[PDB]
Amino acid sequence: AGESLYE
Amino acid sequence: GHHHHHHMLHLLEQIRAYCETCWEWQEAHEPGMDQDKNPMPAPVEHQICPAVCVLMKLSFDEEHRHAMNELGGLQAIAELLQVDCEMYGLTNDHYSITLRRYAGMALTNLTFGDVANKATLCSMKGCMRALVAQLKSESEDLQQVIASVLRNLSWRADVNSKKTLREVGSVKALMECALEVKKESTLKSVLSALWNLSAHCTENKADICAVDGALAFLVGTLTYRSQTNTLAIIESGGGILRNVSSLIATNEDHRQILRENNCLQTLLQHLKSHSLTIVSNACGTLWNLSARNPKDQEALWDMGAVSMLKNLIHSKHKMIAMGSAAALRNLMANRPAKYKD
């Protein structure tokens, strides 16, 4: 899924 | 002039002072019956939500994140999350819910692209236990923020951090959480976290499969009907299934679960998807399931899988080319007798 800033 | 992150310092100092206040209470907490008084520090009376809300918003910018990391922001926010969880448990109190959500949003931003912060947060075992426990909260938005943290913690994790995520029971907790969630957006975060965890080791793959109803649920996610115009649930669920299908292939019981939820036939439909992630995932799952099992080999043959896999072996995408070809070899090398007449 990778990584991300909050959403 | 003297223009620095002193407002940030003030906001961190507020949170550290409230954290201090809370730890005085639980240091003094005489085991069991503390006393008839019953008053823990209430975060509303310290005006903590506005403070953590501001740090959360500042954490979307990289320059404020650098400043936050110099001033021990992640440790303070994580400590804030932990202590509230420890004090009030799984409350539906909106002020406590909002506090944990905003803390968790900041920790999600702070662990993004930062391998040191991933390790630091993972080394804070009590905070990690609190996070994991919040997956049982009745607030599905809290669940969603908690899963967002673990998703980032599970990506590019060092070996100790990988070890800790396993030891705190994050895998079981996320899979059990997933089975009960109603909101689609919560499920996305949850399955995004699991997809990441599922690639770490055999132990994590095994734990996913060992949860009751989990494989049947995961097969259901392959035909999920989104209300957000996205394929995230099918991609993540199928990606989890792809990673764990190496173990399912050894297990006739788990294969039988897949059969009765029409998995193989759904995986063949997934080869026609406009998402190349879905095609790739399916090719990986078919690769595993087509090895060392005449039943499913013969079943795939009967559903026209050989013709479908041929069409993708010369694909320009590498894992689709590799995945379809390896599954094709397996079916070609185990041609059922009734297709030789």
Short mmCIF file of N, CA, C and O in Angstrom, two decimals, chain B residues 91-175:
data_model
loop_
_atom_site.label_atom_id
_atom_site.label_comp_id
_atom_site.label_asym_id
_atom_site.label_seq_id
_atom_site.Cartn_x
_atom_site.Cartn_y
_atom_site.Cartn_z
N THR B 91 -13.38 5.00 25.23
CA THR B 91 -14.50 5.91 25.45
C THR B 91 -15.08 6.39 24.13
O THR B 91 -14.38 6.42 23.12
N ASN B 92 -16.36 6.77 24.15
CA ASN B 92 -16.99 7.49 23.04
C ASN B 92 -17.06 9.00 23.28
O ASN B 92 -17.66 9.73 22.48
N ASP B 93 -16.44 9.47 24.36
CA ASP B 93 -16.33 10.90 24.66
C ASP B 93 -15.71 11.61 23.47
O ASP B 93 -14.58 11.33 23.09
N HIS B 94 -16.48 12.53 22.88
CA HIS B 94 -16.09 13.22 21.65
C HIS B 94 -14.79 14.02 21.80
O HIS B 94 -14.00 14.09 20.86
N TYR B 95 -14.58 14.62 22.97
CA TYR B 95 -13.35 15.38 23.24
C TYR B 95 -12.12 14.47 23.25
O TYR B 95 -11.06 14.85 22.76
N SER B 96 -12.28 13.28 23.82
CA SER B 96 -11.20 12.29 23.91
C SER B 96 -10.95 11.63 22.55
O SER B 96 -9.80 11.40 22.16
N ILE B 97 -12.04 11.33 21.83
CA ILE B 97 -11.97 10.81 20.45
C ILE B 97 -11.23 11.81 19.54
O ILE B 97 -10.27 11.43 18.86
N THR B 98 -11.67 13.07 19.55
CA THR B 98 -11.07 14.12 18.73
C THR B 98 -9.58 14.29 19.02
O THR B 98 -8.78 14.47 18.10
N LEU B 99 -9.22 14.24 20.31
CA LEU B 99 -7.82 14.35 20.76
C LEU B 99 -6.93 13.25 20.16
O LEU B 99 -5.86 13.53 19.62
N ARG B 100 -7.39 12.00 20.27
CA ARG B 100 -6.65 10.85 19.76
C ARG B 100 -6.52 10.89 18.24
O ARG B 100 -5.45 10.58 17.69
N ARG B 101 -7.61 11.27 17.56
CA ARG B 101 -7.62 11.42 16.11
C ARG B 101 -6.58 12.44 15.65
O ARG B 101 -5.78 12.15 14.76
N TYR B 102 -6.58 13.63 16.25
CA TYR B 102 -5.62 14.67 15.88
C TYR B 102 -4.16 14.31 16.21
O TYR B 102 -3.25 14.62 15.44
N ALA B 103 -3.95 13.65 17.35
CA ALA B 103 -2.64 13.12 17.70
C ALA B 103 -2.18 12.12 16.63
O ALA B 103 -1.09 12.26 16.07
N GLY B 104 -3.04 11.14 16.35
CA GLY B 104 -2.78 10.12 15.33
C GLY B 104 -2.55 10.63 13.92
O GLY B 104 -1.76 10.05 13.17
N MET B 105 -3.26 11.71 13.54
CA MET B 105 -3.02 12.39 12.26
C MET B 105 -1.60 12.96 12.20
O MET B 105 -0.92 12.83 11.17
N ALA B 106 -1.17 13.60 13.29
CA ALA B 106 0.19 14.16 13.39
C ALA B 106 1.28 13.09 13.36
O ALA B 106 2.33 13.30 12.74
N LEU B 107 1.04 11.97 14.03
CA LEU B 107 1.98 10.85 14.01
C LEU B 107 2.05 10.18 12.63
O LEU B 107 3.11 9.71 12.23
N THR B 108 0.91 10.14 11.92
CA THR B 108 0.88 9.68 10.53
C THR B 108 1.76 10.56 9.64
O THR B 108 2.58 10.06 8.88
N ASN B 109 1.58 11.87 9.75
CA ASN B 109 2.40 12.82 8.99
C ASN B 109 3.88 12.76 9.38
O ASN B 109 4.75 12.79 8.51
N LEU B 110 4.15 12.65 10.69
CA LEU B 110 5.52 12.64 11.20
C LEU B 110 6.31 11.36 10.86
O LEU B 110 7.54 11.43 10.72
N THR B 111 5.62 10.23 10.73
CA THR B 111 6.25 8.97 10.32
C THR B 111 6.35 8.78 8.79
O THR B 111 7.05 7.87 8.33
N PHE B 112 5.68 9.64 8.02
CA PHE B 112 5.71 9.57 6.55
C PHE B 112 7.08 9.97 5.99
O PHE B 112 7.53 11.10 6.17
N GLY B 113 7.74 9.02 5.33
CA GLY B 113 9.02 9.25 4.66
C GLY B 113 10.19 9.46 5.60
O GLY B 113 11.24 9.95 5.18
N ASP B 114 10.03 9.06 6.87
CA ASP B 114 11.00 9.34 7.93
C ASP B 114 11.24 8.05 8.70
O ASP B 114 10.49 7.71 9.62
N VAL B 115 12.29 7.34 8.33
CA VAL B 115 12.57 6.00 8.88
C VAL B 115 12.97 6.05 10.36
O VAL B 115 12.67 5.12 11.12
N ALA B 116 13.63 7.13 10.78
CA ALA B 116 13.98 7.34 12.19
C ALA B 116 12.73 7.48 13.07
O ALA B 116 12.62 6.81 14.11
N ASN B 117 11.80 8.33 12.65
CA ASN B 117 10.52 8.52 13.36
C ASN B 117 9.65 7.26 13.39
O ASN B 117 8.92 7.05 14.36
N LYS B 118 9.71 6.45 12.34
CA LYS B 118 9.05 5.13 12.33
C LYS B 118 9.61 4.25 13.44
O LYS B 118 8.84 3.59 14.16
N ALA B 119 10.94 4.24 13.58
CA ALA B 119 11.64 3.42 14.57
C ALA B 119 11.41 3.92 15.99
O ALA B 119 11.15 3.12 16.89
N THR B 120 11.53 5.23 16.17
CA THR B 120 11.27 5.88 17.47
C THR B 120 9.89 5.54 18.00
O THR B 120 9.76 5.11 19.15
N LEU B 121 8.87 5.73 17.17
CA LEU B 121 7.48 5.46 17.54
C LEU B 121 7.26 3.98 17.86
O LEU B 121 6.59 3.65 18.83
N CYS B 122 7.84 3.10 17.03
CA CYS B 122 7.78 1.65 17.27
C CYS B 122 8.49 1.24 18.56
O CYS B 122 8.01 0.34 19.25
N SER B 123 9.60 1.90 18.90
CA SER B 123 10.31 1.61 20.16
C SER B 123 9.53 2.02 21.43
O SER B 123 9.81 1.51 22.52
N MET B 124 8.56 2.93 21.29
CA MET B 124 7.67 3.33 22.40
C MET B 124 6.53 2.32 22.57
O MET B 124 5.39 2.59 22.18
N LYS B 125 6.85 1.19 23.18
CA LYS B 125 5.97 0.00 23.20
C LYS B 125 4.58 0.24 23.79
O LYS B 125 3.61 -0.34 23.33
N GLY B 126 4.50 1.09 24.82
CA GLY B 126 3.24 1.37 25.51
C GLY B 126 2.27 2.13 24.62
O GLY B 126 1.08 1.82 24.57
N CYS B 127 2.80 3.13 23.92
CA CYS B 127 2.08 3.85 22.88
C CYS B 127 1.59 2.93 21.75
O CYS B 127 0.46 3.06 21.28
N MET B 128 2.45 1.99 21.33
CA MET B 128 2.10 1.01 20.29
C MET B 128 0.98 0.07 20.74
O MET B 128 0.11 -0.28 19.93
N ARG B 129 1.01 -0.33 22.01
CA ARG B 129 -0.09 -1.11 22.61
C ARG B 129 -1.41 -0.33 22.64
O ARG B 129 -2.48 -0.91 22.41
N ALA B 130 -1.32 0.97 22.93
CA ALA B 130 -2.50 1.84 22.94
C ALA B 130 -3.11 1.97 21.55
O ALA B 130 -4.31 1.77 21.39
N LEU B 131 -2.28 2.28 20.56
CA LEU B 131 -2.70 2.33 19.15
C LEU B 131 -3.46 1.08 18.74
O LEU B 131 -4.61 1.16 18.32
N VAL B 132 -2.82 -0.07 18.90
CA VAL B 132 -3.42 -1.37 18.53
C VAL B 132 -4.78 -1.57 19.19
O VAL B 132 -5.74 -2.00 18.53
N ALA B 133 -4.86 -1.25 20.49
CA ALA B 133 -6.11 -1.35 21.26
C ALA B 133 -7.24 -0.45 20.73
O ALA B 133 -8.41 -0.83 20.81
N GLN B 134 -6.89 0.72 20.19
CA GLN B 134 -7.89 1.63 19.61
C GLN B 134 -8.57 1.12 18.33
O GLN B 134 -9.56 1.70 17.90
N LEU B 135 -8.07 0.03 17.74
CA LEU B 135 -8.78 -0.63 16.63
C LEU B 135 -10.11 -1.29 17.05
O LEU B 135 -10.94 -1.59 16.20
N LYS B 136 -10.28 -1.53 18.36
CA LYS B 136 -11.56 -2.01 18.90
C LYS B 136 -12.53 -0.89 19.31
O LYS B 136 -13.64 -1.18 19.75
N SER B 137 -12.13 0.37 19.14
CA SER B 137 -13.00 1.52 19.45
C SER B 137 -14.21 1.58 18.53
O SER B 137 -14.10 1.28 17.34
N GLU B 138 -15.35 1.97 19.09
CA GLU B 138 -16.59 2.11 18.31
C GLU B 138 -16.56 3.28 17.31
O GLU B 138 -17.38 3.32 16.40
N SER B 139 -15.62 4.21 17.49
CA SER B 139 -15.38 5.27 16.50
C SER B 139 -14.59 4.74 15.30
O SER B 139 -13.38 4.51 15.39
N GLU B 140 -15.27 4.57 14.17
CA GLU B 140 -14.63 4.10 12.94
C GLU B 140 -13.71 5.14 12.30
O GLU B 140 -12.85 4.77 11.50
N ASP B 141 -13.89 6.41 12.63
CA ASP B 141 -12.94 7.45 12.22
C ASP B 141 -11.65 7.36 13.03
O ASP B 141 -10.58 7.61 12.48
N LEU B 142 -11.74 7.00 14.31
CA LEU B 142 -10.53 6.77 15.12
C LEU B 142 -9.75 5.58 14.56
O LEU B 142 -8.55 5.70 14.28
N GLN B 143 -10.44 4.44 14.40
CA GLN B 143 -9.90 3.25 13.71
C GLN B 143 -9.12 3.61 12.44
O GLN B 143 -8.02 3.11 12.21
N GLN B 144 -9.73 4.47 11.63
CA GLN B 144 -9.17 4.92 10.36
C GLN B 144 -7.85 5.68 10.55
O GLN B 144 -6.91 5.47 9.78
N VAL B 145 -7.79 6.55 11.55
CA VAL B 145 -6.56 7.30 11.86
C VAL B 145 -5.50 6.37 12.45
O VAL B 145 -4.31 6.52 12.15
N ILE B 146 -5.93 5.42 13.28
CA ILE B 146 -5.02 4.45 13.90
C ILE B 146 -4.37 3.56 12.84
O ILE B 146 -3.16 3.32 12.89
N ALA B 147 -5.19 3.08 11.90
CA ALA B 147 -4.70 2.27 10.78
C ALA B 147 -3.75 3.06 9.86
O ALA B 147 -2.80 2.49 9.33
N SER B 148 -4.02 4.36 9.69
CA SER B 148 -3.12 5.24 8.92
C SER B 148 -1.72 5.30 9.52
O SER B 148 -0.73 5.30 8.78
N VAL B 149 -1.63 5.35 10.85
CA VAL B 149 -0.34 5.35 11.55
C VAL B 149 0.40 4.04 11.27
O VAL B 149 1.55 4.06 10.87
N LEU B 150 -0.29 2.92 11.48
CA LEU B 150 0.31 1.59 11.33
C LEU B 150 0.69 1.27 9.89
O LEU B 150 1.67 0.57 9.65
N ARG B 151 -0.09 1.80 8.94
CA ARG B 151 0.23 1.72 7.51
C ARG B 151 1.60 2.35 7.22
O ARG B 151 2.44 1.74 6.56
N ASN B 152 1.83 3.57 7.72
CA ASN B 152 3.13 4.24 7.57
C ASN B 152 4.25 3.55 8.38
O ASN B 152 5.39 3.47 7.90
N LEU B 153 3.94 3.06 9.58
CA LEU B 153 4.91 2.31 10.39
C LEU B 153 5.32 0.97 9.76
O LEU B 153 6.44 0.51 9.98
N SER B 154 4.41 0.36 9.00
CA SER B 154 4.68 -0.91 8.32
C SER B 154 5.41 -0.77 6.98
O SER B 154 5.83 -1.78 6.41
N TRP B 155 5.55 0.46 6.47
CA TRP B 155 6.22 0.72 5.19
C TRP B 155 7.65 1.20 5.41
O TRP B 155 7.88 2.18 6.12
N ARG B 156 8.60 0.52 4.78
CA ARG B 156 10.04 0.76 4.96
C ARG B 156 10.47 0.67 6.43
O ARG B 156 11.35 1.41 6.89
N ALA B 157 9.85 -0.26 7.16
CA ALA B 157 10.17 -0.51 8.55
C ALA B 157 11.52 -1.21 8.64
O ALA B 157 11.83 -2.07 7.82
N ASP B 158 12.34 -0.82 9.63
CA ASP B 158 13.56 -1.57 9.95
C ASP B 158 13.18 -2.89 10.65
O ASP B 158 12.03 -3.06 11.05
N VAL B 159 14.15 -3.80 10.80
CA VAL B 159 13.84 -5.16 11.28
C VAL B 159 13.30 -5.20 12.71
O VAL B 159 12.42 -6.01 13.00
N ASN B 160 13.83 -4.34 13.59
CA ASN B 160 13.30 -4.21 14.97
C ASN B 160 11.85 -3.73 14.98
O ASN B 160 11.01 -4.29 15.68
N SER B 161 11.57 -2.68 14.20
CA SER B 161 10.21 -2.15 14.06
C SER B 161 9.24 -3.19 13.50
O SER B 161 8.11 -3.30 13.98
N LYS B 162 9.68 -3.94 12.49
CA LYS B 162 8.92 -5.08 11.98
C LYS B 162 8.63 -6.10 13.09
O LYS B 162 7.51 -6.60 13.20
N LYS B 163 9.65 -6.38 13.89
CA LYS B 163 9.54 -7.29 15.05
C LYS B 163 8.51 -6.78 16.06
O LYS B 163 7.68 -7.55 16.55
N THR B 164 8.56 -5.48 16.37
CA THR B 164 7.63 -4.87 17.33
C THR B 164 6.17 -4.88 16.84
O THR B 164 5.28 -5.24 17.61
N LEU B 165 5.94 -4.49 15.59
CA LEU B 165 4.59 -4.51 14.98
C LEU B 165 3.94 -5.89 15.08
O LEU B 165 2.73 -6.00 15.31
N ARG B 166 4.74 -6.93 14.88
CA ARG B 166 4.32 -8.32 15.08
C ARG B 166 4.01 -8.60 16.56
O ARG B 166 2.94 -9.09 16.89
N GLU B 167 4.96 -8.28 17.44
CA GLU B 167 4.86 -8.60 18.87
C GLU B 167 3.66 -7.96 19.58
O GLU B 167 3.06 -8.58 20.46
N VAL B 168 3.30 -6.74 19.19
CA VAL B 168 2.12 -6.05 19.75
C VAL B 168 0.76 -6.51 19.18
O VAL B 168 -0.28 -5.97 19.57
N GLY B 169 0.76 -7.48 18.26
CA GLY B 169 -0.48 -8.09 17.76
C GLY B 169 -1.26 -7.18 16.83
O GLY B 169 -2.50 -7.18 16.84
N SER B 170 -0.54 -6.41 16.03
CA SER B 170 -1.14 -5.46 15.10
C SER B 170 -1.83 -6.18 13.95
O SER B 170 -2.88 -5.73 13.47
N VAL B 171 -1.26 -7.31 13.52
CA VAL B 171 -1.76 -8.07 12.37
C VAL B 171 -3.14 -8.67 12.66
O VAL B 171 -4.09 -8.46 11.90
N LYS B 172 -3.23 -9.41 13.76
CA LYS B 172 -4.50 -9.99 14.24
C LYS B 172 -5.53 -8.90 14.48
O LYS B 172 -6.69 -9.04 14.08
N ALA B 173 -5.11 -7.82 15.14
CA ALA B 173 -6.01 -6.72 15.50
C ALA B 173 -6.60 -6.02 14.27
O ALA B 173 -7.80 -5.73 14.24
N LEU B 174 -5.77 -5.76 13.26
CA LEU B 174 -6.23 -5.14 12.01
C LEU B 174 -7.18 -6.05 11.21
O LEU B 174 -8.16 -5.56 10.64
N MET B 175 -6.90 -7.35 11.18
CA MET B 175 -7.74 -8.31 10.46
C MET B 175 -9.10 -8.51 11.15
O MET B 175 -10.13 -8.57 10.47
#
